[PDB]
Amino acid sequence: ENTSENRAQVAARQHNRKIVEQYMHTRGEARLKRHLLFTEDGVGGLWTTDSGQPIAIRGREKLGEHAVWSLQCFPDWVWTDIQIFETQDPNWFWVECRGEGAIVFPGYPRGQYRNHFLHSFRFENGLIKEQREFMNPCEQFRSLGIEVPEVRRDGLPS
C-alpha cells in the first residue's frame, strides 16, 4: 500500500543500497576513506578465519587504521560479479561476489588470491553498523602457499 511508512522504508532501502554499491566499488586510495561509510561505533571484518573466531574491527577510527593494512596487503584488489540482495529488513543487505588480487602477507611469498565471498551489511541511520565477510579460507591458504588439509568423504555418492 502507498503509505508514508512504506515510503520511508523504500527511501531507507534505496539510500542503504547506494552505500553498499559504493562500498563494493571502492578501490585504491579511496579505500582509506571508506570508514566514513560506517557509524562511529561501526564494526567490520572477516568472519571466516582458520582460528574460528572473527577478526572484528570495531569503531570508525579503528576501521580507518585497518584500511591502511588492507591496502598494503591487498594492493590491487577488485570485487567482481557483485550481486546485491535487499531483504525484508531495509537495514540489512547481503552481497554475493568474487574477488581477486595480489596478496602480500609478510612471512609468506607474494601471491595471487581469488575467492568467492558473501558480505553482510547492517545499517543504522543510513551508515553501516556491521559489515561481515564470509569466504572459504582454504583458497587463502592456497594463495599463501599453505598446504590445505583434505577431507576424505568415503561413501559420498556418486
Ligand X SMILES: O=C(O)c1ccccc1NC1CCCCC1
Per CB under 6 A, residues contacting ligand X are 45-46, 55, 70, 74, 77, 99, 133, 140, 153
Q: Please list every residue from 100 through 139 that binds a second copy, using CB under 8 A.
A: 105-108, 116, 118, 120, 134, 136-139
Q: Is 77 in the site for a second copy (CB under 8 A)?
A: no
Pick out residues in 25-64 that bind a second copy (CB under 8 A): 47-52, 55, 57, 62
Q: Which among ligand X, a second copy, none contacts residue 19 (Cβ within 5 to 8 A by kind)?
A: none
Residue 133 site contact among ligand X, a second copy, none (CB < 5 to 8 Å, cut-off depends on kind):
ligand X
Interface with a second copy, residue 86, by CB under 8 A: yes
CB atoms within 10 A of CB 9: 15
Minimum distance from CB of 47 to ligand X (Å)?
Answer: 9
The least distance separating ligand X from the CB of residue 5, rounded to whole angstroms, comes to 37
Quick one: 13 or 43, whose CB is closer to ligand X?
A: 43
> Residue 29 CB, nearest distance to a second copy (Å)?
18
Task: Report the alpha-carbon angle 79-83-84, nearest 5.
Answer: 110
Long-range contacts of 84-91 (CB under 8 A, 24+ apart): 84/17, 84/20, 84/21, 84/24, 86/13, 86/17, 90/9, 90/10, 90/12, 90/13, 90/16, 90/123, 91/12, 91/16, 91/122, 91/123, 91/124, 91/129
At residue 19, φ and ψ (nearest 5 deg) are: -70, -45
> Between residues 9 and 39, which has the closer beta carbon with respect to ligand X?
39
Instruction: Select the span of 4-12, 19-27, 30-38, 82-90 touching a second copy (CB under 8 A).
Output: 82-90
